[PDB]
Amino acid sequence: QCTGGADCTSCTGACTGCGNCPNAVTCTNSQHCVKANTCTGSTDCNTAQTCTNSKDCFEANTCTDSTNCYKATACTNSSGCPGH
């Protein structure tokens, strides 16, 4: 269709397995959800409010299976969250 694989930087919707998006609001997985409202099993999460395996969950309230949870509330097996 447009977003499916490991390369986007083309569509302007939601990314689901690419690695590089333009102005998408969110992305499901991959590595390029920095300016997204919500990053799941991905990374770059400074604008979003949560993650599920992102290595940049700074402004995230929930982060499971991720690391570097700059100020988190719920953390189990993640890094940068309540524990360090």
State the Cα–Cα distance between residues 30 and 33, nearest whole angstrom.
Answer: 8
Structural tokens at position 1: 């269709």
Q: Hey, what's the torsion of the CAs at 56, 59, 45, 42, to 10 degrees?
A: 80
Tally Cβ neighbours within 10 Å of residue 83.
11
CATH number of the structural domain 1-84? 2.160.20.50
Residue 84 CB contacts under 8 Å (≥ 6 apart), including other chains? none
